[PDB]
Amino acid sequence: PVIAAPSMWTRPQIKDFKEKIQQDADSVITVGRGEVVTVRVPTHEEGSYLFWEFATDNYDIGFGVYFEWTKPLLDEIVPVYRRDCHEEVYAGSHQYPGRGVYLLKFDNSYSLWRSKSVYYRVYYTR
Amino acid sequence: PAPDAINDALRSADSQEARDACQKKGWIVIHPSNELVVEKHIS
């Protein structure tokens, strides 16, 4: 199973991103104290690349990406690491290794006293 | 346009404007958040 390296980057405008994402209730997730939230994104029948964007309001949150092949095989696309996404919008992409499901990991586990608000968005190509 | 190129282009210069442009042209397609299964776990 050859697996392409992901791309990751950031872009400066956080305020505009959040204002745009807030327009959809389901695109804003509350990650509780010590909670890990997993957003599952399936590979698309016509699809090659997946895109993700996310931001938090105040505090950093853990972010990583795993791929679930269709007990099951789990590959690490993006290691989970705390991100500055409260300061800037964090984005990234990956080429489809095969048929399966992407797990977007928002990891608050290290946070004892603080919930996090996660604004996020997902695209894909053809 | 190849997906490789859509990707490398967006990465190179990324903005809401470019997203919308790509979306309008069908190059990228937004995955509705209501279709996405969300899990929660406490460590």
Residue numbers in the entry:
A (entry chain A): 367 to 436, 473 to 528
B (entry chain B): 17 to 59
Provide excerpts from the study:
ACBD3 is a Golgi resident protein involved in the maintenance of the Golgi structure and regulation of intracellular trafficking between the endoplasmic reticulum and the Golgi. However, in enterovirus-infected cells, the ACBD3 GOLD domain interacts preferentially with viral non-structural 3A proteins, which causes re-localization of ACBD3 to the sites of virus replication. In this study, we present a structural, biochemical, and biological characterization of the complexes composed of human ACBD3 and the 3A proteins of four representative enteroviruses. The crystal structures revealed the details of the ACBD3-3A interaction, the 3A-3A interaction causing the assembly of the ACBD3-3A heterotetramers, the interaction between the ACBD3-3A complex and the lipid bilayer, and the roles of these interactions in facilitation of enterovirus replication.
To analyze the dimerization of the GOLD: 3A complexes in more detail, we generated a mutant EVD68 3A protein (hereafter referred to as LVVY mutant) with the following four mutations at the putative dimerization interface: L25A, V29A, V34A, and Y37A. Taking advantage of the vicinity of the C terminus of the ACBD3 GOLD domain and the N terminus of the ordered part of the EVD68 3A protein, we connected the last residue of ACBD3 (R528ACBD3) through a short peptide linker (GSGSG) to the first ordered residue of the EVD68 3A protein (T163A/EVD68). Both GOLD-3A wild-type and LVVY mutant fusion proteins formed crystals, which diffracted to a resolution suitable for further structure determination. The crystal structures of the GOLD: 3A complex consisting of two individual proteins, the GOLD-3A fusion protein, and its LVVY mutant were almost identical with low root-median-square deviations, confirming that neither the fusion-protein approach nor the LVVY mutation affected the correct folding of these proteins. Three lines of evidence document the dimeric state of the wild-type GOLD-3A fusion protein and the monomeric state of its LVVY mutant in vitro. Secondly, the small-angle X-ray scattering (SAXS) profiles of these proteins correspond to the calculated scattering curves of a dimer of the wild-type GOLD-3A fusion protein and of a monomer of its LVVY mutant. Thirdly, crystal contacts corresponding to the 3A dimerization interface are not preserved in the crystal structure of the GOLD-3A LVVY mutant, indicating that this mutant cannot dimerize through this interface even at very high protein concentrations (of approximately 20 mM) present within the protein crystal. Nevertheless, we observed a significant difference in FRET efficiency between the wild-type GOLD-3A fusion protein and its LVVY mutant. Finally, we analyzed the impact of the LVVY mutation on enterovirus replication. Using a reporter subgenomic replicon assay for EVD68 established earlier, we found replication of this mutant significantly attenuated in both U-87 MG and HaCaT cells.
